[PDB]
Amino acid sequence: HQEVPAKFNFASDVLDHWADMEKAGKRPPSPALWWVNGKGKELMWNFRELSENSQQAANVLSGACGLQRGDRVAVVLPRVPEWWLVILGCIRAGLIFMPGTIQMKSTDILYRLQMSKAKAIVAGDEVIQEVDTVASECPSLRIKLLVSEKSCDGWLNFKKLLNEASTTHHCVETGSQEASAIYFTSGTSGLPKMAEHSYSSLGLKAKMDAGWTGLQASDIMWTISDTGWILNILCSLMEPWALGACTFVHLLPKFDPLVILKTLSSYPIKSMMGAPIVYRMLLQQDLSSYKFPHLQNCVTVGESLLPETLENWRAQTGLDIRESYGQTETGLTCMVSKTMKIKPGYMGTAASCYDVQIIDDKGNVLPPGTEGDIGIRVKPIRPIGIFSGYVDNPDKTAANIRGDFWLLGDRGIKDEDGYFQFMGRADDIINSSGYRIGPSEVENALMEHPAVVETAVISSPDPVRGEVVKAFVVLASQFLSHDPEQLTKELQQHVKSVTAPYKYPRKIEFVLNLPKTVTGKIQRAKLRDKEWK
Numbered sequence: 189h190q191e192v193p194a195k196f197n198f199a200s201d202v203l204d205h206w207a208d209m210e211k212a213g214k215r216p217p218s219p220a221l222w223w224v225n226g227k228g229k230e231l232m233w234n235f236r237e238l239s240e241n242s243q244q245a246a247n248v249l250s251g252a253c254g255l256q257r258g259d260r261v262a263v264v265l266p267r268v269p270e271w272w273l274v275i276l277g278c279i280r281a282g283l284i285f286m287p288g289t290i291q292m293k294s295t296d297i298l299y300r301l302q303m304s305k306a307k308a309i310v311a312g313d314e315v316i317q318e319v320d321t322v323a324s325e326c327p328s329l330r331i332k333l334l335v336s337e338k339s340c341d342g343w344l345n346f347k348k349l350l351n352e353a354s355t356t357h358h359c360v361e362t363g364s365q366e367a368s369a370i371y372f373t374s375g376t377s378g379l380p381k382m383a384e385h386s387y388s389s390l391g392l393k394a395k396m397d398a399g400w401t402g403l404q405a406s407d408i409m410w411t412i413s414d415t416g417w418i419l420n421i422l423c424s425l426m427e428p429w430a431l432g433a434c435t436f437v438h439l440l441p442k443f444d445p446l447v448i449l450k451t452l453s454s455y456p457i458k459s460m461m462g463a464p465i466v467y468r469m470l471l472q473q474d475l476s477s478y479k480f481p482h483l484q485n486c487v488t489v490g491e492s493l494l495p496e497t498l499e500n501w502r503a504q505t506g507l508d509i510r511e512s513y514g515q516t517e518t519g520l521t522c523m524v525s526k527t528m529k530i531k532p533g534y535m536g537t538a539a540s541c542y543d544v545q546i547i548d549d550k551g552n553v554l555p556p557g558t559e560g561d562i563g564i565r566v567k568p569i570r571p572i573g574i575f576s577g578y579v580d581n582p583d584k585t586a587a588n589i590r591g592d593f594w595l596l597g598d599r600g601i602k603d604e605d606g607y608f609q610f611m612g613r614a615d616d617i618i619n620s621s622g623y624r625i626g627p628s629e630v631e632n633a634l635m636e637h638p639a640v641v642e643t644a645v646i647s648s649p650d651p652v653r654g655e656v657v658k659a660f661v662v663l664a665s666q667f668l669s670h671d672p673e674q675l676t677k678e679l680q681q682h683v684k685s686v687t688a689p690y691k692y693p694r695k696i697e698f699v700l701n702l703p704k705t706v707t708g709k710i711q712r713a714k715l716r717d718k719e720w721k
């Protein structure tokens with residue numbers, strides 16, 4: 189059960205509120221999207237322009253391309269304004285948007301198009317070849333829209349059609365619970381599932397969290413993220429636009445901490461969001477060379493924020509980092525808001541929609557100080573912000589419900605004030621530098637190589653990245669004579685070539701056998717335990 193309005197749409201109910209206010213002269217034209225490429229190109233839309241231009245977006249998707257309410261549109265773009273325009277476009281036209289990363293390889297993309305039966309893909313120069321390799325294998329795929337300075341046979345020209353489109357679109361009266369986005373999400377075993385979010389679970393939820401960061405209507409916030417991750421829709425797009433604030437985007441084509449540091453010291457960025465690894469890379473630089481007195485709010489999600497990282501950032505910049513915690517399925521689940529005291533090593537308290545608790549094997553709420561499983565009350569009322577379920581897979585959804593609670597799959601402890609401390613993933617999912625990696629994905633990749641007869645992929649402790657993907661590999665005997673170091677690199681290269689490179693095995697150990705259950709299932713937990721300390 190849920191307690192929402194019957195209808196909601198971020199675009200008509202939030203974005204267009206800010207456009208009208210400018211139109212009505214009740215607010216001056218206020219910056220919404222400020223994009224830079226680092227090479228001297230900058231573009232800015234105020235809220236009217238953002239509105240007008242994304243209505244153009246919607247008319248491209250629904251008029252030119254004929255996409256219809258409920259159709260699914262894959263979106264694989266780098267950090268260019270058109271991602272924001274397209275996403276808004278989908279929201280207006282009632283299209284289900286499915287972001288992914290430009291790190292994807294052809295098989296990654298095939299898997300998503302076939303699984304989702306997408307009717308459209310909106311891509312850039314990065315993956316176009318990749319897509320063309322597999323498009324003929326996707327019978328539901330009708331529309332291929334390319335965001336590029338070049339045109340290409342078989343691709344519609346987004347930037348041209350956009351410019352040709354009307355600035356008036358009639359926004360669809362989308363329902364609160366109606367599908368708006370699918371985000372593919374990795375699991376403890378098997379390949380990625382389709383996590384479906386509603387118009388409310390993203391848009392209403394973000395409206396209600398808006399401000400936790402410390403952002404005000406007149407500030408600029410820079411979220412540093414691949415456009416594919418849910419971080420992007422919630423913090424780069426919805427958080428600021430809920431408040432009428434401006435969102436900053438740097439193409440940041442190579443993730444360069446020095447460019448980050450120069451950007452912070454050259455623009456009036458008030459808030460920044462990024463995974464802890466971003467703050468760690470930044471700390472490896474010489475921050476004395478930079479000053480950014482305008483920056484006041486630094487937040488993080490995706491990984492545990494190390495007390496030492498928190499400490500050093502404070503020492504080196506005079507600023508706190510306020511942590512938050514969540515997953516694709518739940519969004520922002522816990523946070524340290526601007527006014528809360530920071531407890532090093534704790535990720536904050538429940539998002540305001542959520543009853544978050546530590547729960548036992550039978551689903552009972554545990555007392556403070558007791559380790560258990562972290563859970564969001566979803567019965568009898570399902571809170572605004574929880575996703576709608578795994579598409580086509582209600583069993584897997586049912587499988588993460590225990591009693592009245594949805595299970596995050598993380599262990600934790602709750603203190604006396606309701607602050608949560610993360611105590612580890614309870615399953616085989618790997619978290620490496622803020623990525624959520626399914627072990628089967630990396631295993632299948634390795635198994636394609638003739639050298640690998642059997643493999644198990646588990647997490648390995650790493651100072652810098654927290655945790656890295658490690659493979660245990662049983663070798664085809666022919667290969668026992670190869671140089672190990674050479675063979676390791678060959679295998680690493682192989683994984684990187686067939687699936688998004690971020691998941692490759694940074695460590696590989698060759699072994700004669702993998703431990704198993706009497707039923708013949710590999711005991712990753714066993715390997716994982718031995719690998720830690």
Ligand SMILES: CCCC(=O)SCCNC(=O)CCNC(=O)[C@@H](O)C(C)(C)COP(=O)(O)OP(=O)(O)OC[C@H]1O[C@@H](n2cnc3c(N)ncnc32)[C@H](O)[C@@H]1OP(=O)(O)O
Pocket residue numbers: 290291412413414417418419443463465466489490491513514515516518519520621622623684689690691
């Ligand atoms: C409510 C929940 C919200 C959320 O938290 S959503 C989750 C948020 N998570 C994140 O944002 C993840 C953030 N972390 C990162 O982005 C980091 O990985 C970070 C900061 C960019 C550092 O990245 P890098 O080490 O440069 O690269 P990477 O860690 O992504 O690993 C990729 C490996 O492969 C390479 N690669 C990348 N693109 C490639 C390409 N197109 N072709 C061939 N190779 C490529 C890359 O060099 C790296 O390999 P290597 O370490 O150099 O051997």
Ligand SMILES: Nc1ncnc2c1ncn2[C@@H]1O[C@H](COP(=O)(O)O)[C@@H](O)[C@H]1O
Pocket residue numbers: 373418488489490491492493511512513514515516517535596597598610613619623624
């Ligand atoms: N603040 C944090 N501390 C520790 N782990 C986190 C934090 N935020 C996110 N995670 C991990 O990342 C997962 C979410 O991955 P994703 O679904 O890609 O957002 C969670 O289930 C946690 O395992």
